[PDB]
Ligand SMILES: *[C@@H]1O[C@H](CO)[C@@H](O[C@@H]2O[C@H](CO)[C@@H](O[C@H]3O[C@H](CO)[C@@H](O)[C@H](O)[C@@H]3O)[C@H](O)[C@H]2NC(C)=O)[C@H](O)[C@H]1NC(C)=O
Ligand SMILES: *[C@@H]1O[C@H](CO)[C@@H](O[C@@H]2O[C@H](CO)[C@@H](O)[C@H](O)[C@H]2NC(C)=O)[C@H](O)[C@H]1NC(C)=O
Ligand SMILES: Nc1ncnc2c1ncn2[C@@H]1O[C@H](COP(O)(O)=S)[C@@H](O)[C@H]1O
Ligand SMILES: *[C@@H]1O[C@H](CO)[C@@H](O)[C@H](O)[C@H]1NC(C)=O
Ligand SMILES: *[C@@H]1O[C@H](CO)[C@@H](O)[C@H](O)[C@H]1NC(C)=O
Ligand SMILES: *[C@H]1O[C@H](CO)[C@@H](O)[C@H](O)[C@H]1NC(C)=O
């Protein structure tokens with residue numbers, strides 16, 4: 001009492017220890033002077049020094065006995081000064097019925113972003129992060145949320161609230177140039193506030209049109225007039241506002257009367273991204289930053305508990321991207337290869353892009369291909385790869401927008417690129433922006449509230465799926481977006497949207513056998529191959545025989561075509577089924593099944609085709625059209641090397657209906673896949689269902705071109721109009737359980753590819769062993785959903801599983 005400042009801050013005294021500002025110089029302050037009298041001006045917490053304090057006028061919050069009555073207690077008052085449990089101290093309790101005030105018949109959703117919180121931080125430092133660890137334990141968690149490319153702040157935040165890829169929402173980076181606008185985007189510029197930049201519909205706009213209000217305390221686009229709308233409450237970005245004030249403001253919004261109180265909220269903190277850059281992802285500063293944000297989340301949860309909203313609000317704790325350690329030894333300078341040239345502007349970092357400096361004049365006319373070829377395969381194990389945006393892997397969906405420079409660079413993990421050492425920051429800092437499948441780029445996601453399941457660890461999903469999920473939690477109709485609505489139904493207690501397989505628009509045409517003359521196709525067939533001598537006999541199949549074929553080749557149902565004006569017909573064979581397009585003189589898809597103990601022949605089958613009498617014969621279906629053709633060759637969808645009955649060559653696979661145009665350079669990849677890889681996959685998985693086909697994406701928009709658009713994209717080769725695929729897709733399907741074969745799976749294990757169809761193999765740097773083919777396949781892996789979008793096909797429509805469980809499977813991207 002006599003030795004303490006409690007009750008007497010700033011009052012003068014004769015009785016020994018002092019409690020006025022002069023005491024410090026004299027070193028005769030009471031031991032508790034700072035804690036009792038000064039600290040309260042600078043902190044938002046109660047402590048054992050402050051419990052029952054005489055109210056101070058300058059204190060940020062109160063711990064005085066009268067604080068509950070005046071309603072300005074520090075958030076931790078009850079826990080510290082009345083011995084009640086904090087939110088984190090309480091054991092998990094399930095939230096089956098929400099406990100909400102009137103106005104929250106639909107509960108609120110809060111989107112809470114920790115910038116640059118890599119998923120790995122929680123994997124390794126969970127023991128140092130009790131609040132986030134408890135949200136994981138009590139809630140719905142994934143070890144990894146996959147961000148969008150490039151893995152940067154504005155693209156990923158705007159992707160989260162729109163469900164769009166950056167190529168569609170238009171925010172592709174923190175610095176952009178738009179040629180059509182002839183303007184540059186910068187966060188320091190006034191162009192940041194120009195609505196022209198922000199495409200799509202953020203969830204706060206979706207919400208407003210359907211009568212819910214929004215409160216954003218910082219989010220990319222929330223301080224911009226998008227479709228003529230701001231959030232009902234928004235803050236002009238000011239990184240200097242302390243984290244505690246942002247959280248206290250959101251807690252004020254949740255106490256507004258129901259007429260003006262938002263349903264959708266955002267909260268954004270700059271940590272741990274800021275510390276990640278400045279000190280690296282493995283550092284004392286990042287540990288301290290992680291503990292600080294853990295405490296801020298705890299402050300929100302304690303605040304919600306005080307308001308009795310902790311079993312009402314749906315919390316989505318999220319991050320935009322991860323963080324990697326940069327190195328000056330892992331930075332590439334283009335001036336080494338190009339010299340100190342002054343005609344190009346190079347966007348530096350791991351997501352490096354190149355543009356002419358003379359814009360908008362030379363933006364399209366500039367010789368990108370020149371520099372592409374100049375920078376290809378210059379060193380062995382080169383750590384960067386030049387790509388024309390349309391040749392990047394389709395899984396990145398990084399090409400449609402004109403704001404994406406025609407020449408991009410793909411960089412290996414930990415590697416960055418600039419023009420020269422002058423035009424970058426510090427090379428040794430932490431960075432992000434790399435490929436969105438790299439481990440250290442993976443993001444945080446925890447869902448907690450009445451809408452979310454409890455104690456669930458979901459498989460990896462993409463942040464573009466979150467918009468639909470938030471719409472479901474708010475009973476909103478989602479705007480068109482790149483999420484698959486229902487793919488995240490497994491995260492929710494009570495899904496509101498039941499998805500249905502899409503309807504096939506035109507019913508399948510039939511391609512009947514027509515008697516016609518055995519023609520010369522100009523083939524020099526290998527003697528070994530037993531030809532088809534009675535076609536009418538060999539392809540007149542009994543209902544019984546067909547049921548056996550269908551069961552073996554379409555165990556999941558036939559791919560369905562969703563294209564508007566398209567006429568496909570089913571072609572049956574003993575080892576494979578196919579959907580043939582008369583309009584493009586080519587199959588859209590084949591389906592077959594390689595069994596564990598099947599044989600692959602090394603026997604030559606070049607310059608051999610057999611006529612299919614089910615379709616009219618065409619010049620492009622003849623060996624003669626391809627004989628010494630320098631511009632294009634051909635390849636088979638269903639592989640002739642695969643024989644079940646004989647050990648020779650499966651003759652039916654040599655039909656004119658099972659060939660697609662194919663560059664000689666691509667034949668190496670295709671030959672290696674069917675000869676070597678497909679055999680290894682069949683063995684390892686105890687059988688593999690295969691569906692392969694061509695892909696036409698001339699608009700490089702990740703979508704199948706219309707038949708109308710395809711009629712203008714045909715090339716003329718030897719005075720014939722031929723359509724040459726942009727890509728080839730493959731979809732492998734085995735069982736999770738290798739005890740079962742692909743016709744009797746309880747759970748499907750899938751692996752899909754969208755292989756670019758290029759005239760050379762410059763991408764793979766072929767010099768030193770066809771091991772490079774596997775690397776190319778992995779880099780160009782895709783979600784089945786990516787294949788569906790780009791082919792206009794829809795798979796697995798006859799699996800017994802509920803539709804949402806299939807959508808989960810189709811949106812999966814594999815890791816290795
Ligand atoms: C991701 O979802 C996007 C939103 O649905 C979708 O983008 C939309 O793409 C269509 C097709 O280009 C555009 O619609 C336009 O179609 C005509 C062509 O005849 C255009 O001339 C008109 O502008 C018309 O609006 C939309 O503009 C476009 N929306 C946005 C926001 O970009 C993407 O296709 C989806 N991406 C993938 C890979 O599936
Ligand atoms: C950005 O936010 C910071 C902190 O919230 C504001 O800076 C404060 O300004 C007040 C008076 O204007 C000073 O008394 C404080 O000392 C400042 N705090 C700090 C820590 O700098 C600043 O005003 C804000 N800028 C705006 C409104 O954009
Ligand atoms: N809504 C916003 N408006 C403007 N700037 C923002 C906004 N949100 C975050 N920032 C800032 O943009 C910067 C980009 O982060 P990066 O450098 O890790 S890609 C961040 O450091 C952040 O400090
Ligand atoms: C494009 O912007 C540049 C930069 O200010 C300017 O000099 C020029 O007038 C603009 N217009 C065109 C189309 O070149
Ligand atoms: C690439 O072109 C640059 C000019 O920008 C030149 O310095 C260099 O010699 C060229 N490199 C080659 C031919 O690969
Ligand atoms: C094409 O003709 C044969 C096809 O068997 C091939 O061996 C040869 O290399 C090619 N000839 C020319 C002129 O390229």
Ligand SMILES: [Zn+2]
Pocket residue numbers: 115116152153154273320321
């Ligand atoms: Zn960020």
